[PDB]
């Protein structure tokens, strides 16, 4: 079913953001596992897989709308080098992602693509849940101290 | 995540309406039970619990958006003295609640807080279901007569 | 069954104290959850629910005694800004609650309302259990240190 | 164990009241069954059995305290001729029973027979539950009408 | 169904005998339990319950026959002071009960109330079984001696 | 929670009585077992354990009330030399225990420590049950003879 | 079976040591529970119960040997005011207990009471296991720090 050109462009922009996140979260997960921080490693693995699920739905919607999913352009991964930096890098990425989701929803509404809007709203709910997790972890580091925070994430 | 100040004000206004409804429905429930109208008592108890679930979601959303949930201001409970009046009191409250929900959704849409809009839409769906129940009960009183209607609500 | 007017006034006073505690504990629970201190959040949620159960029994007793339960007057919530303050706010509220329960029991005994006395004694047992919990938590903060205490309350 | 002579007199007075109620409730139950009001008949049967359980506990306590249980004196049964009268006769008896229970509790407290007091308090709780039931039924007759009330008590 | 007036008088006389036995056996049971003769206590409790079942059937029959069951007149309880006396008191009562049952059966036969006769015959069979039990216990006291007889009735 | 000094003194006095009883009953149990009176030995062991449970509750209450439990002062054990004397020694101790419980309940009532009163009432119920057991055993020795009484307590 | 008088005296000395330990461990358990150090409380409770089992075996052996078990003399309880002191008080007591056990075993061997020796050796093995536990806990306080050690003993 032929979709709106600018809707497809927005969906590809969102997809691009998801693809950055998949790789950033996967690498952060394996860094945490290598360091023995297995609870963080496991949680971050699940974040990567969740982003994969959103990317899948976007690819499927773009193809239904007769557009070309762009999996070729990979933007800048924000790779941290210690736990605090990695969490902040994930948060910086998620805040860019939600800005782009809101702009995409505005356009879907304007052109009456209510099904694409609903998909993007579901993704936005997941991304806000991730922001909640990240803000909470950064706050816990302050409240319990970094050494205790890391200790609590050694064991699954 | 820093929310829109006016969104947070709207969410607190909705929360205030829920808090009235929780208490009004709980008292109505226990009045019906005291009178031996246990089917009405049980249904009204479930209505109170459902309002508690909505209030919980509003409180959680307000905190996520870095606002202060207001559980201190309790507005006017509309307490009936007999079954007909109690149902009409619940209906009067629900109609004010839906007006406020619609106004809050307008504002969430305007500032692109699509997740808050979706939460409020889910609450609005529940409130419209309650309106349907109340209108139906008031109509049944007219069709079957008050004595039969009360008889049908003695036993669970 | 027509109850003693002063007993009913005392039961409404107790009920008012419970209604403050329900809302104060519910808000504290959701604050702790927002901060990632989920063990505190869960325990405080259960404290709120327990207070709801006491309020229910008081409402039921008042109605049986042919009085009017007052769910309209909500007194001052004592909301802390950090864990130490929130626990102390809960403790300050519980100490006022037990003072009022003891005075109400004295009056029930004087007028031979032994069943209302038994209800209040059961509520008082629950409130003293909550005092024990609160004093214990405040003591643990001193014994293990604040950072360790909070660490031990991150995971349920 | 040698009990207080006046305590034993009070326990025998309570026992006498229970023995009236056992027989009154049993006869009312069988009258309702004969008329085909089987739900009333079953509930009233259970009321008779509950009074039997209280009488047993009183007989047991009297014997432990080295007194003579009096099962010989049977006071006046209050037998109605229709459902409304039967319910009111039960209520009239229950209100005499609670007056005597409260006076017995006062005396037990004054002579430090705290175990006898606790037994009497439990019986008083059961008698107040019966009062609630009876007041509720009389109220339902007014709210739903006699014909509907009786209809609702034909089948168990 | 309108019964014979004299049949109903006979049924009320039998019922009166049963009501004596219920209370006499119940008191004897609780006396034996107080003394630690729990096997006698349990057996005598079951005798009381069985008499209650006969009384129920008599009450039900009287009401079907459009008479008024008399639960108000309680005759003389025969209460013993030791095991031998208590068994003999029960036997003395049962022998009066069977005389009255036989006279009632004669009258039922004469007026062709064959269903009332059959009820009374079933009650008479139960009362003769009780006579057998009582005569047997009294004989055992002679054969094994009182101390052994009581020893054998300590434990259930 | 800071308790009343005299309440704590009373609870420590009760505790002291329990500690005597624990040891007296345990020794009596093991004497009966050594003599092959295993039913008495087992029953008396269970009495010792039940007293331990009461002592635990008193210790816990004293600590909650910010007092010092006294497990150091052990009063005079009343040890019999044969079954009759041992049972009477237990009864002599239980009668002093109930006097102290009643006096402690009075004081708890007067300072409004209704939760401590309820604990003591529960202990008093257990002590009166023990008195019933002991009086019953002494009476059975009279009724069945000492040799039969002991015979009946050889096998569990 | 007539035992050696000095063996019996040694067994009563051991028994006296056990009786101190039972009470000291029980009080320490309940102190740790009141402070919210429930893992220490539970472990120390089990230490008290285990000492009770040893005391029982000593009492049984003394009676078999035709001696009089002494449960009347209670020696000095060593009660700490904080966790470090309580552990050291338990250790001080256990070291005295093992000294007395060794002297008792010597005498049992000298008079050929090999069964009493075997009982005492089993008790000694249990006491050395307790010493191992206590020395280990005191070492852990040094290795992990007091605050972490207490944190690790909050939850069971």
Helices E5-34 and E83-110, axial angle in degrees (round to 10): 170
- Residues in chain F with CB shorter than 8 Å from the CB of D118 are 121, 125
What is residue F39's three-state secondary structure? helix
Kindly determine whether residue A102 and residue B114, on different chains, have CB atoms separated by under 8 Å.
yes
CA distance linking residue F14 with residue F71, whole number of Å: 11
Tokens of G123: 């008790």
Nearest to D114 among F105, F132, F135 (CB): F105
CA distances to E147, F105, F134, G59 from F85, in Å: 21, 30, 11, 20
Neighbouring C-beta atoms of residue C34, cutoff 10 Å:
19
Q: Is the dihedral of CA E93, E99, E101, E103 positive or negative?
A: negative
Instruction: Give per-residue burial for B11-31: e unless 16+ CB within 10 Å, then b.
Output: bbbbbbbbbbbbbbbbbbbbb
Tokens of C77: 């919530």
Closest among D22, D2, D9, D156 to D93, alpha carbons compared: D22
Residue in A42, A43, A142, A148 to test binding to C, most C beta-carbons within 10 Å: A148
Neighbouring C-beta atoms of residue F132, cutoff 10 Å:
16
CA distances to A138, B136, D30, D147, F114 from B140, in Å: 56, 6, 37, 20, 51
**Whose structure tokens read 């998801």?**
A18
- Residues in chain A with CB shorter than 8 Å from the CB of B115 are 121, 124-125, 128
Burial class of C128 by CB neighbour count within 10 A (0 to 12, 13 to 18, 19+) = buried
CA distance linking residue B14 with residue B97, whole number of Å: 7
Residue in F30, F61, F62 to test binding to G, most G beta-carbons within 10 Å: F30
Q: Locate all alpha helices (DSSP H) within chain G, ordered by sequence.
A: 5-34, 38-64, 83-110, 114-144, 146-151
What is residue A134's three-state secondary structure? helix
What is residue E152's three-state secondary structure? coil
CA distance linking residue B92 with residue B83, whole number of Å: 14
CA distance linking residue G68 with residue G74, whole number of Å: 16
Neighbouring C-beta atoms of residue C142, cutoff 10 Å:
9
**Contact between E22 and D59 (Cβ < 8 Å):** no
- Residues in chain E with CB shorter than 8 Å from the CB of F39 are none
**Contact between F3 and F113 (Cβ < 8 Å):** yes
CA distance linking residue B91 with residue B87, whole number of Å: 6
**Whose structure tokens read 């505190």?**
C40
G1 annotated to bind ligand: no
CA distance linking residue C95 with residue C112, whole number of Å: 26
Is CATH 3.30.2320.50 correct for F1-156? no
CA-based R_g, chain D, Å: 17
Q: Locate all alpha helices (DSSP H) within chain B, ordered by sequence.
A: 5-34, 38-64, 83-110, 114-144, 146-151
**E with G: touching (≥3 Cβ pairs within 8 Å):** no
Phi, psi of C75 (to 5 degrees): -80, -170
**3-state helix/strand/coil string of C20-59:** HHHHHHHHHHHHHHHCCCHHHHHHHHHHHHHHHHHHHHHH
CA distance linking residue F137 with residue E36, whole number of Å: 7
CA distance linking residue F147 with residue F141, whole number of Å: 8
Taking phi over 0 as left and psi of -120 to 50 as alpha, with beta for the rest, G59 belongs to alpha
Tokens of D49: 């059995």
Nearest to B59 among C30, C63, C71 (CB): C30
Helices F83-110 and F114-144, axial angle in degrees (round to 10): 160
CA distance linking residue G105 with residue G124, whole number of Å: 10
Closest among F42, F41, F48 to F18, alpha carbons compared: F48
Kindly give, in sequence order, each residue whose CB lies less than 8 Å from that of residue F25, ignoring residues fewer than 6 positions away: F44, F45, F47, F48, F51, F90
Burial class of E25 by CB neighbour count within 10 A (0 to 12, 13 to 18, 19+) = buried
C94 annotated to bind ligand: yes
CA-based R_g, chain E, Å: 17
CA distance linking residue A128 with residue F25, whole number of Å: 66
Q: Is the dihedral of CA A110, A112, A114, A116 positive or negative?
A: negative
G127 annotated to bind ligand: yes
CA distance linking residue C97 with residue C155, whole number of Å: 30
CA distance linking residue D80 with residue D77, whole number of Å: 10
CA distance linking residue A145 with residue G121, whole number of Å: 50
What is residue B56's three-state secondary structure? helix
CA distance linking residue A105 with residue A98, whole number of Å: 11
Determination approach:
X-ray
CA distance linking residue E84 with residue E150, whole number of Å: 10
Burial class of B136 by CB neighbour count within 10 A (0 to 12, 13 to 18, 19+) = exposed
**Separation of first and last alpha carbons in chain F:** 46
Tokens of A27: 């690498």
CA distance linking residue E90 with residue E95, whole number of Å: 9
**Contact between F106 and F55 (Cβ < 8 Å):** no
Query: Reported resolution in A?
Result: 1.5
Chain CA centroid to CA B53, Å: 10
Closest among E154, E32, G70, G58 to F39, alpha carbons compared: E154
**B with F: touching (≥3 Cβ pairs within 8 Å):** no
CA distances to D35, E66, E108, E123, F128 from E4, in Å: 20, 10, 9, 20, 55
Local structure of residue B1 (DSSP, 8 states): -
Measure E120 CA to nearest chain D CA, in Å.
Answer: 19
Tokens of C99: 């003072």
**By a Cβ cutoff of 8 Å, what residues of chain E touch chain D?**
23-24, 26-27, 30-31, 33-34, 56, 59-60, 63-64, 69, 71-72, 74, 76-77
**Contact between G126 and G54 (Cβ < 8 Å):** yes
**Contact between B86 and B24 (Cβ < 8 Å):** no
Query: Domain segments of chain B: what residues?
Result: 1-156
**Whose structure tokens read 């019953």?**
F136
Kindly determine whether residue D1 and residue F124, on different chains, have CB atoms separated by under 8 Å.
no
Neighbouring C-beta atoms of residue B155, cutoff 10 Å:
11
Q: Locate all alpha helices (DSSP H) within chain D, ordered by sequence.
A: 5-34, 38-64, 83-110, 114-144, 146-151
Beta strands in F7-125 (DSSP E): none
Local structure of residue F3 (DSSP, 8 states): -
Neighbouring C-beta atoms of residue B81, cutoff 10 Å:
9
Nearest to E36 among F136, F148, F151 (CB): F136
What is residue F51's three-state secondary structure? helix
Chain CA centroid to CA A153, Å: 21
CA distance linking residue G22 with residue A14, whole number of Å: 69
**Separation of first and last alpha carbons in chain G:** 46
Inter-chain Cβ pairs, chain C and chain G, closer than 8 A: 27
Tokens of A118: 């609903």
CA distance linking residue C123 with residue G40, whole number of Å: 30
Closest among D146, D133, D123, D131 to D54, alpha carbons compared: D123
**Contact between B80 and B88 (Cβ < 8 Å):** yes
Q: Locate all alpha helices (DSSP H) within F38-81, ordered by sequence.
A: 38-64
Length of chain D: 156
Kindly give, in sequence order, each residue whose CB lies less than 8 Å from that of residue B47, ignoring residues fewer than 6 positions away: B21, B25, B29, B90, B130
Residue in C16, C27, C55, C58 to test binding to B, most B beta-carbons within 10 Å: C27
Burial class of F139 by CB neighbour count within 10 A (0 to 12, 13 to 18, 19+) = middle
């Amino acid at each position: 079913m032929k979709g709106d050109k600018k809707v497809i462009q927005h969906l590809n922009k969102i997809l691009g953001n998801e693809l950055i996140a998949i790789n950033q979260y996967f690498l952060h997960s394996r860094m945490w596992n290598d360091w023995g921080l297995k609870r963080l490693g496991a949680h971050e693995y699940h974040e990567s897989i969740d982003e994969m699920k959103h990317a899948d739905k976007l690819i499927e919607r773009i193809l239904f709308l007769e557009g070309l999913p762009n999996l070729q352009d990979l933007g800048k991964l924000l790779i941290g080098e210690n736990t605090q930096e990695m969490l902040q890098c994930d948060l910086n990425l998620e805040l860019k992602a939600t800005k782009d989701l809101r702009e995409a929803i505005v356009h879907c509404e304007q052109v009456h693509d209510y099904v694409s809007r609903d998909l993007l709203k579901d993704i936005l709910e997941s991304e806000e849940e991730h922001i909640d997790y990240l803000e909470t972890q950064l706050g816990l580091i302050q409240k319990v101290g970094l050494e205790n925070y890391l200790q609590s994430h050694m064991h699954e």
